[PDB]
Design a protein around this nucleic acid. Structure first.
Ligand SMILES: [Mg+2]
Ligand SMILES: [Mg+2]
Ligand SMILES: [Mg+2]
Ligand SMILES: [Mg+2]
Ligand SMILES: [Mg+2]
Ligand SMILES: [Mg+2]
Ligand SMILES: [Mg+2]
Ligand SMILES: [Mg+2]
Ligand SMILES: [Mg+2]
Ligand SMILES: [Mg+2]
Ligand SMILES: [Mg+2]
Ligand SMILES: [Mg+2]
Ligand SMILES: [Mg+2]
Ligand SMILES: [Mg+2]
Ligand SMILES: [Mg+2]
Ligand SMILES: [Mg+2]
Ligand SMILES: [Mg+2]
Ligand SMILES: [Mg+2]
Ligand SMILES: [Mg+2]
Ligand SMILES: [Mg+2]
Ligand SMILES: [Mg+2]
Ligand SMILES: [Mg+2]
Ligand SMILES: [Mg+2]
Ligand SMILES: [Mg+2]
Ligand SMILES: [Mg+2]
Ligand SMILES: [Mg+2]
Ligand SMILES: [Mg+2]
Ligand SMILES: [Mg+2]
Ligand SMILES: [Mg+2]
Ligand SMILES: [Mg+2]
Ligand SMILES: [Mg+2]
Ligand SMILES: [Mg+2]
Ligand SMILES: [Mg+2]
Ligand SMILES: [Mg+2]
Ligand SMILES: [Mg+2]
Ligand SMILES: [Mg+2]
Ligand SMILES: [Mg+2]
Ligand SMILES: [Mg+2]
Ligand SMILES: [Mg+2]
Ligand SMILES: [Mg+2]
Ligand SMILES: [Mg+2]
Ligand SMILES: [Mg+2]
Ligand SMILES: [Mg+2]
Ligand SMILES: [Mg+2]
Ligand SMILES: [Mg+2]
Ligand SMILES: [Mg+2]
Ligand SMILES: [Mg+2]
Ligand SMILES: [Mg+2]
Ligand SMILES: [Mg+2]
Ligand SMILES: [Mg+2]
Ligand SMILES: [Mg+2]
Ligand SMILES: [Mg+2]
Ligand SMILES: [Mg+2]
Ligand SMILES: [Mg+2]
Ligand SMILES: [Mg+2]
Ligand SMILES: [Mg+2]
Ligand SMILES: [Mg+2]
Ligand SMILES: [Mg+2]
Ligand SMILES: [Mg+2]
Ligand SMILES: [Mg+2]
Ligand SMILES: [Mg+2]
Ligand SMILES: [Mg+2]
Ligand SMILES: [Mg+2]
Ligand SMILES: [Mg+2]
Ligand SMILES: [Mg+2]
Ligand SMILES: [Mg+2]
Ligand SMILES: [Mg+2]
Ligand SMILES: [Mg+2]
Lengths: 147, 117, 141
RNA sequence: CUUGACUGCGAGACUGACACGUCGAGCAGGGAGGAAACUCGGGCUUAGUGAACCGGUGGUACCGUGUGGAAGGGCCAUCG
RNA sequence: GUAGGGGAGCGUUCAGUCCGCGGAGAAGCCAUACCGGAAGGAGUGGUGGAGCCGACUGAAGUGCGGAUGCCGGCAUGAGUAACGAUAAAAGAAGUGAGAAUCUUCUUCGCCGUAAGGACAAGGGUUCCUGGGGAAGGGUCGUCCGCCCAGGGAAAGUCGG
RNA sequence: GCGAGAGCUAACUUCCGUAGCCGAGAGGGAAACAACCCAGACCAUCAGCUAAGGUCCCUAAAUGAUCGCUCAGUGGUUAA
RNA sequence: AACCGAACCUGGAGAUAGCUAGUUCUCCCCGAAAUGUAUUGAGGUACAGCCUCGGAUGUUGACCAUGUCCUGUAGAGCAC
RNA sequence: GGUCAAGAUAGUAAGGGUCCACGGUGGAUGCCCUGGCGCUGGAGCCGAUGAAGGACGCGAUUACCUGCGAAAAGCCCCGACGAGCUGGAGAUACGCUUUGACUCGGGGAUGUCCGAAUGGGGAAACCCACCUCGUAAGAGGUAUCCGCAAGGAUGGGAACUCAGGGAACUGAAACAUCUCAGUACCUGAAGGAGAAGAAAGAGAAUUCGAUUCCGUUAGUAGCGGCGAGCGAACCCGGAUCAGCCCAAUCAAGCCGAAGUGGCUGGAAAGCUACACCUCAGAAGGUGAGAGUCCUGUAGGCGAACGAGAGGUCGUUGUUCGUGAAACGAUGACUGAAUCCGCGCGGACCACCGCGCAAGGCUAAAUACUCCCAGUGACCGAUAGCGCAUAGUACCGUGAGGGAAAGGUGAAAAGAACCCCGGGAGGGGAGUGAAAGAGAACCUGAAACCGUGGACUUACAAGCAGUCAUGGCACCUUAUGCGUGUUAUGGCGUGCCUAUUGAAGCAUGAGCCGGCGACUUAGACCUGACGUGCGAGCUUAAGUUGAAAAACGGAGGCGGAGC
């Protein structure tokens, strides 16, 4: 918001020449080359997303920090019981764990644990996985995510 | 995101300025004239490394000629004299002999005028 | 965080200006001139102010889209398809996807085993060589 | 005596930043002069020239907006 | 080695992750003879008082001496020019922390179809009283058209 | 510089041909001096040889040698 | 309404600007051009010419000798 | 030793210089937030029942702001909360409140004067009337246009929508058709959307079936001083689906798990030892960093009121510039058939196809963002809005233009009292962890001004450097490769720009600090590098999911050229 009116005369004055106070050489002016709202979202080739995810699981397998799992056992939606279950499975606390399952209550039991991040269904992705140390796969989704 | 200058310009500046202590007047207190003075300083440094190598040779030569002539010999004739008798001395060293040790320089003189005969 | 992109995947850009490193003063642009200036324009087909090559050259003939025939080769159908046959919706599922255009068959390289083909037209030597190998060619009514 | 001051082409060079420009063997149709070998696609040579665009005219039956026609364009020639 | 092309890097914010520091003291600031081929980087000490370094990766409002560039602060000219009509001042006395400048007295000087008096337009409390003295007053002020408080303006007949 | 025109066989002139340098070239020499002469600087050295150019003092280096010349400061700027 | 050969305010509006200024961190490698022709063109632009990077080739380049052909200047000469 | 003589050298600095120390100025830098910015999502009209916007008022004291309107920081009832309250304002006094205050939610009553203003006038916020009731006080009425009446209209609203009117710069490297562009601007009407809409259609399959919007077709078909440049549609894939009548659950709120001891510290959240809750480890506040101290979060509960025809001339529209110019569209003139009839299919005719003009309404997908909420590889005081708030101060007759502004401390415990001074200012004391935080209060750079100290300078020619050496001084990366400073010698034509050529007496520049210039976009073009698939490769709109991503083949690229 600077009027576009010429401030004063093109020659004469003895000053340097200016036309406006809305100019990027002007304190309080415009940014020359600022950021305007834009987008960064492209389409990475599908086969590469797939090969990726794959290679995530593969990487975590040579770990060996894969832990395939069937059924679970967490009483009725309680975090303390998640903690005991985890503890029986070697999850001391000294690792960060991604859990993927489709069962409402096991997630509902993990969540509030600092060191567990909780993911439903095929919310899976290379980032979240590679972010953490351990992966709780579970396993039910694994025999389908082969075929 | 934006990235101000924060801190960099002042560090650069102080660098120049701190190279520039003992410079007269604004040359040691204003950045630009410091930085500038320093460009010319660049020229002078590089040059004078070569040039001091030029200068010291000169000095040695002066002293040598002096000693040479004390004992009745020109320098040039003294140096062909030395090359003839295949004495192979630095003129840095020849100077120091000439200035520091009288009798020894004398001996080199006699050897050289012999090589001349 | 462990990961790194491939050597030579990502070159850092040109930051012209930014000191005598470096492209000093004029940022590539050279000294003075219309090319030096900052404005959107010339553009690309502007020679001198002159009289352009394209403008000096003779125009020939009108323009017409007509019909274009989608090419199918023999050599494709031949050697290693083992005749899953042609039909109409079969060709697609194998490899000659287009739509909106009529299909033509052309000679390509070689014929041997006999097959039944379903196109919209084909070349003389193609019908001739497809029959001389025992196969028939079908043009519509 | 004649209409080569010719159609369909062009191996290969000269020459120009490009566009131009210049020379040209040889093949076909089909002719001229010669008894004939042969020569002729203008003038001993080097100047006598104007790119595109839009339009005139003679041929041509390539496109022609549901189809068949016709207006109109396109092609070769050609004039301003 | 100039325009220009190419190559390897330094530093800055923000972002993800890893490491990890921090009231027995972070960033920032300050001094420094150490380190690196250069952008640069550490060691120690002084400052400061609550946040921050290193590594890899990502994205930029990412690096300044110039543009009679923009905003801001402070220099030079310099204790220089000037203090705004050449109508003019002197003494006593008073006051006061402080007086050539304020108050009183006595004179002196200058306007007197004005430099006196009364309206209009405009201004807006500048009027009166009592107080004040940072700044405003081209010096100084104890004073003021300045600052604070409180008062003051009255229409059947003037003007609408 | 050499080769020409133009110009007054003037110009630190103008326009071409040609070599080199400056341009974009630091270093030594020519007092000073883009261009001339020597010479192309990756960095360090209180090391040695040379180029052009120099060796009375300022100023590194023979007040060198031998046979002459000039006596005019010619040297240290022009002609019939 | 203190600058009128067309007032002032805001807007189109970041008008256009073949023009002048300005263009910021470091080191390493190579490294120009200011010529040609064409331009309502002459301090601007197109294409060549010259630079660099990459991929191809693989001595094709360079100098110098030998061989061979082309030339009408220097000089000279007076045959037109 | 004394006199004379000849010679050589020293110190003193009026002021200056370099360095060091210690301050002042000033407000960079770092940290911070009470203020902004964008995106997404929500929500969308007000007004004769007097609006938007104001004027004047209302206070124990009231200038500004807020709230209100002579019933005037407020009055009535209902609902919530349950102990404080008496606005920003922090200040004294008066007092109110468990008979339920204050605050929050919801309705009503009052609501001066101006402003569409509307009784008449008027230089807005002021002047002057008339009528009915009333005892007066007071109350109500007195505009224009449609209508019989009832009732409707006028005015305002950033963008968004449609309509009447409609630029130029500029691009064409000049310009006139052309382009900018039906953009800017002006006017109108209206809504929370609006427009548009129910085929005399698109079209070429005798296919499709209201409109709008997205992708795509496609820079294709075409347009064009056939120059610059302009540029569809059909198909196909989506978003949302609709066609009827006439003329013969959210808005107050409540409930809500779990920790202590020792240590450092001014202060505990940090450290440490054991300990617990988690459908709750989102976040903020607490003297430094708190899952378990407070507010909260997950989860649950939750209200009386509240909310959901044809023609000819002149022209023009879409790719439509007189082109062979169809078709629509009107300004002028003229003017037919009604079913074996009518209108189209790009001059024009036949044929073959699609269509029922001259009568109206219509939600949904779409646009926008004044306002509200969430988010952020957005900004943190020259940044971000012009404002850490102000359209104020200030400038202008006016239209209009238009600033800078930030920080004690955890807590005011805001320094009683003593000393110099009229005061200002300061020194103590006291508080504080620290006054190395004192209200010109976070850090506090540089320019610039001073005090003090080191070595220095009064025979000297200088781009102020650089090299070499000697003198003095100093010893925390420091007894050597030294650090500071100097004497003397050698050497040396500021920087940038622009140029054939710059120290140039050519340009720019007072100084330092901050701001300050090669970027973004498209699903465009063309190369280099890399990666995934590979004779194949890939999706776009969108759909669903969403502390992620998956689907989606319409389309596009290769595949054959001439
Ligand atoms: Mg601001
Ligand atoms: Mg040497
Ligand atoms: Mg580069
Ligand atoms: Mg520069
Ligand atoms: Mg320039
Ligand atoms: Mg034309
Ligand atoms: Mg014809
Ligand atoms: Mg014809
Ligand atoms: Mg180099
Ligand atoms: Mg980081
Ligand atoms: Mg930071
Ligand atoms: Mg500056
Ligand atoms: Mg000036
Ligand atoms: Mg200034
Ligand atoms: Mg004086
Ligand atoms: Mg003076
Ligand atoms: Mg004087
Ligand atoms: Mg005076
Ligand atoms: Mg006076
Ligand atoms: Mg006087
Ligand atoms: Mg007294
Ligand atoms: Mg007086
Ligand atoms: Mg008296
Ligand atoms: Mg008077
Ligand atoms: Mg009055
Ligand atoms: Mg005064
Ligand atoms: Mg007094
Ligand atoms: Mg008075
Ligand atoms: Mg009376
Ligand atoms: Mg010349
Ligand atoms: Mg040189
Ligand atoms: Mg030289
Ligand atoms: Mg010299
Ligand atoms: Mg010269
Ligand atoms: Mg020699
Ligand atoms: Mg000598
Ligand atoms: Mg005037
Ligand atoms: Mg401009
Ligand atoms: Mg414009
Ligand atoms: Mg080289
Ligand atoms: Mg030039
Ligand atoms: Mg070129
Ligand atoms: Mg060869
Ligand atoms: Mg001759
Ligand atoms: Mg003194
Ligand atoms: Mg008020
Ligand atoms: Mg009342
Ligand atoms: Mg109540
Ligand atoms: Mg309460
Ligand atoms: Mg009225
Ligand atoms: Mg014009
Ligand atoms: Mg033009
Ligand atoms: Mg309206
Ligand atoms: Mg017409
Ligand atoms: Mg038209
Ligand atoms: Mg019509
Ligand atoms: Mg700040
Ligand atoms: Mg005091
Ligand atoms: Mg001093
Ligand atoms: Mg003397
Ligand atoms: Mg002296
Ligand atoms: Mg010049
Ligand atoms: Mg040049
Ligand atoms: Mg000068
Ligand atoms: Mg100058
Ligand atoms: Mg000039
Ligand atoms: Mg000047
Ligand atoms: Mg590739």
């Amino acid at each position: 918001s600077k009027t576009g009116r010429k401030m004063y005369g093109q020659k004469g004055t003895g000053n340097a020449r200016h036309g406006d106070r809305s100019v990027p050489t002007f304190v309080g002016g415009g940014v020359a080359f600022g950021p305007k709202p834009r987008s960064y979202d492209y389409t990475l080739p599908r086969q590469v997303r797939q090969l990726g995810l794959a290679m995530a699981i593969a990487s975590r397998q040579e770990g060996g920090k894969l832990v395939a799992v069937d059924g679970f056992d967490i009483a009725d939606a309680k975090t303390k019981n998640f903690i005991s279950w985890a503890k029986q499975n070697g999850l001391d606390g000294t690792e960060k764990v991604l859990l993927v399952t489709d069962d409402e209550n096991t997630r509902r039991a993990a969540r509030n644990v600092s060191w567990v991040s909780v993911l439903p269904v095929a919310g899976v992705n290379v980032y979240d996985i590679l972010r953490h140390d351990r992966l709780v796969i579970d396993a039910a989704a694994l025999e389908i995510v082969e075929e | 995101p934006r990235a101000k200058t924060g801190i960099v310009r002042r560090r650069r500046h102080k660098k120049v300025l701190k190279r520039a202590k003992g410079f007269w007047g604004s040359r040691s207190k204003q950045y630009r004239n410091a930085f500038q003075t320093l460009l010319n300083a660049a020229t002078y440094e590089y040059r004078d490394r070569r040039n001091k190598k030029r200068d010291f040779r000169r000095l040695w030569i002066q002293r040598i000629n002096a000693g040479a002539r004390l004992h009745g010999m020109n320098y040039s004739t003294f140096i062909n004299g030395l090359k003839r008798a295949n004495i192979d001395l630095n003129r840095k060293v020849l100077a120091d002999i000439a200035a520091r040790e009288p009798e020894a320089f004398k001996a080199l003189v006699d050897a050289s005028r012999n090589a001349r005969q | 965080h462990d990961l790194k992109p491939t050597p030579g995947s990502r070159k850092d850009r040109k930051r012209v200006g930014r000191g005598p490193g470096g492209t000093d003063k004029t940022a590539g642009r050279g000294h003075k001139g219309q090319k030096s200036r900052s404005g959107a324009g010339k553009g690309a087909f502007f020679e001198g102010g002159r009289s352009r090559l394209i403008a000096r050259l003779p125009k020939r003939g009108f323009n017409n889209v007509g019909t274009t025939y989608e090419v199918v080769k023999l050599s494709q159908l031949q050697d290693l398809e083992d005749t899953t046959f042609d039909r109409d919706t079969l060709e697609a599922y194998r490899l000659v996807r287009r739509k909106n255009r009529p299909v033509k068959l052309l000679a390509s390289g070689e014929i041997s085993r006999a097959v039944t083909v379903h196109v919209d037209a084909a070349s003389a030597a193609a019908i001739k060589a497809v029959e001389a190998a025992g196969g028939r060619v079908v043009l519509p009514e």
